[PDB]
Amino acid sequence: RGSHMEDFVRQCFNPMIVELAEKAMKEYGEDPKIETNKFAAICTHLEVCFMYSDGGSKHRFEIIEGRDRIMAWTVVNSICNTTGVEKPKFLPDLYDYKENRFIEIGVTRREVHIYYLEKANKSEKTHIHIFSFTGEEMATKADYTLDEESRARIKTRLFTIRQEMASRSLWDSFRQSE
Ligand SMILES: O=C1CCCN1CC[C@H](C[C@@H](C[C@@H](CCN1CCCC1=O)N1CCCC1=O)N1CCCC1=O)N1C=CCC1=O
Ligand SMILES: O=C(NCCS(=O)(=O)c1ccccc1)c1nc([C@@H]2CCCN2C(=O)c2c(Cl)cncc2Cl)[nH]c(=O)c1O
Ligand SMILES: [Mn+2]
Numbered sequence: 558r559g560s561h562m563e564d565f566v567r568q569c570f571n572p573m574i575v576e577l578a579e580k581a582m583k584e585y586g587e588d589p590k591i592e593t594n595k596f597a598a599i600c601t602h603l604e605v606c607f608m609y610s611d612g613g614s615k616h617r618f619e620i621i622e623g624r625d626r627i628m629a630w631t632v633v634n635s636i637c638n639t640t641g642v643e644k645p646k647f648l649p650d651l652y653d654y655k656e657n658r659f660i661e662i663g664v665t666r667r668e669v670h671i672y673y674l675e676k677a678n679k680s681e682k683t684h685i686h687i688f689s690f691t692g693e694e695m696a697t698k699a700d701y702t703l704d705e706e707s708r709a710r711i712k713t714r715l716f717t718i719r720q721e722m723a724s725r726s727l728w729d730s731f732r733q734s735e
């Protein structure tokens with residue numbers, strides 16, 4: 558059963574993002590051919606995590622998202638046992654070597670405030686940064702980490718994904734899926 562959303566994902570995101578999203582869904586026991594909206598969301602989150610890590614200086618961020626669970630956790634302990642930060646309960650997405658904190662990246666299609674709150678309850682010390690498909694963002698203590706231009710490019714890319722879906726009439730199904 559092959560959907561339009563699946564072919565759009567593979568044409569919209571680069572093959573390394575796609576393959577990484579596929580590996581993650583197989584690990585949760587989910588199928589990219591069926592839960593195709595979640596497939597698209599995971600790719601999007603992945604690309605945002607990678608654009609974010611590219612926004613700073615050369616080796617400012619450690620990328621924790623996109624690894625297998627065991628290795629991601631191994632890099633968390635090394636960071637913790639080197640910096641003195643406490644171990645998060647849940648796997649974060651990045652580590653900021655400059656500000657010395659873990660970052661949880663969020664990408665939501667609903668209002669930014671609602672999603673921020675839910676993500677907080679699911680780690681007090683981990684910094685949180687949410688991006689919307691409409692162009693909004695909210696970060697912990699109003700500290701947005703990156704400069705304006707790096708965040709702006711992420712928001713542009715998110716709004717382009719939104720248009721590409723709507724042009725194909727997959728947006729509304731994608732928006733009401735979350
Ligand atoms: O430069 C570009 C333009 C678009 C594609 N691309 C590759 C560079 C990175 C991905 C990552 C990929 C990679 C880094 C290289 N490694 C190390 C482990 C195995 C592997 O693939 N991963 C995968 C998950 C953990 C991690 O860091 N990056 C960031 C560093 C260079 C690179 O390829 N990136 C940044 C923009 C989107 C994107 O994919
Ligand atoms: O890393 C993550 N999960 C594994 C580590 S965790 O400790 O289980 C973990 C669990 C929740 C939050 C953070 C870490 C992670 N998960 C989510 C959501 C909720 C859980 C399932 N889920 C997804 O399948 C998903 C989605 Cl909806 C969008 N984009 C990527 C992914 Cl994976 N949202 C993220 O923002 C994210 O970073
Ligand atoms: Mn993650």
Ligand SMILES: [Mn+2]
Pocket residue numbers: 602650661662663
């Ligand atoms: Mn995340």
